[PDB]
Protein backbone atom coordinates (compact mmCIF):
# COMPACT_ATOMS: atom_id res chain seq x y z
CA UNK A 1 0.00 0.00 0.00
CA UNK A 2 1.29 3.45 -1.11
CA UNK A 3 4.24 4.64 -3.26
CA UNK A 4 5.68 8.11 -4.14
CA UNK A 5 8.71 8.20 -6.47
CA UNK A 6 10.67 5.44 -8.25
CA UNK A 7 14.29 5.20 -9.56
CA UNK A 8 15.28 5.12 -13.26
CA UNK A 9 17.11 1.80 -12.77
CA UNK A 10 16.68 0.00 -9.45
CA UNK A 11 12.92 0.52 -9.52
CA UNK A 12 12.50 0.68 -5.73
CA UNK A 13 9.53 2.60 -4.32
CA UNK A 14 10.94 5.58 -2.45
CA UNK A 15 8.98 8.57 -0.99
CA UNK A 16 10.20 11.98 0.16
CA UNK A 17 9.49 15.68 0.49
CA UNK A 18 11.41 18.97 0.45
CA UNK A 19 15.09 19.08 1.50
CA UNK A 20 15.23 15.28 2.08
CA UNK A 21 17.69 15.16 -0.84
CA UNK A 22 16.90 13.98 -4.34
CA UNK A 23 18.77 10.66 -4.59
CA UNK A 24 17.91 7.01 -3.90
CA UNK A 25 18.29 4.32 -1.18
CA UNK A 26 21.62 3.42 -2.83
CA UNK A 27 22.27 4.34 -6.49
CA UNK A 28 23.41 7.94 -6.50
CA UNK A 29 21.76 8.40 -9.93
CA UNK A 30 19.41 11.28 -9.03
CA UNK A 31 16.57 10.63 -11.52
CA UNK A 32 13.19 9.28 -10.24
CA UNK A 33 9.74 8.95 -11.78
CA UNK A 34 6.51 9.75 -9.94
CA UNK A 35 4.66 6.39 -10.07
CA UNK A 36 1.12 5.96 -11.49
CA UNK A 37 -2.17 7.21 -10.07
CA UNK A 38 -4.61 5.63 -7.70
CA UNK A 39 -7.71 6.94 -9.55
CA UNK A 40 -8.36 4.44 -12.36
CA UNK A 41 -8.20 5.63 -15.97
CA UNK A 42 -11.04 4.62 -18.27
CA UNK A 43 -10.56 3.85 -21.99
CA UNK A 44 -12.60 3.39 -25.18
CA UNK A 45 -12.09 0.45 -27.54
CA UNK A 46 -11.79 2.37 -30.83
Amino acid sequence: ATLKYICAECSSKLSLSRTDAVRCKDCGHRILLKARTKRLVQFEAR
Binding site: H29, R30, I31
Partner: protein
Amino acid sequence: KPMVNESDGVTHALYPQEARLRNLTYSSGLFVDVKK
Protein backbone atom coordinates in the same frame (compact mmCIF):
# COMPACT_ATOMS: atom_id res chain seq x y z
CA LYS B 1 36.25 10.94 -20.11
CA PRO B 2 32.80 12.41 -19.13
CA MET B 3 32.40 13.94 -15.67
CA VAL B 4 29.91 15.94 -13.59
CA ASN B 5 31.40 18.36 -11.04
CA GLU B 6 28.38 19.33 -8.90
CA SER B 7 28.38 20.93 -5.44
CA ASP B 8 26.92 18.36 -2.99
CA GLY B 9 28.66 15.46 -4.65
CA VAL B 10 32.09 14.38 -5.86
CA THR B 11 32.54 14.03 -9.63
CA HIS B 12 30.05 11.51 -11.03
CA ALA B 13 31.33 9.63 -14.10
CA LEU B 14 28.64 10.78 -16.59
CA TYR B 15 26.75 9.02 -19.41
CA PRO B 16 24.79 10.12 -22.51
CA GLN B 17 21.20 9.18 -21.68
CA GLU B 18 21.47 11.14 -18.43
CA ALA B 19 22.94 14.46 -19.54
CA ARG B 20 20.05 14.17 -21.98
CA LEU B 21 17.33 13.96 -19.34
CA ARG B 22 18.96 16.36 -16.93
CA ASN B 23 19.98 18.94 -19.52
CA LEU B 24 23.69 18.90 -18.80
CA THR B 25 26.76 18.69 -21.03
CA TYR B 26 28.44 15.52 -22.26
CA SER B 27 31.96 16.94 -21.87
CA SER B 28 35.13 15.91 -20.08
CA GLY B 29 38.16 17.51 -18.48
CA LEU B 30 41.30 19.03 -19.97
CA PHE B 31 44.69 19.08 -18.23
CA VAL B 32 48.07 20.46 -19.37
CA ASP B 33 51.61 19.80 -18.04
CA VAL B 34 52.34 23.49 -17.47
CA LYS B 35 55.96 24.58 -16.68
CA LYS B 36 57.13 27.15 -14.05
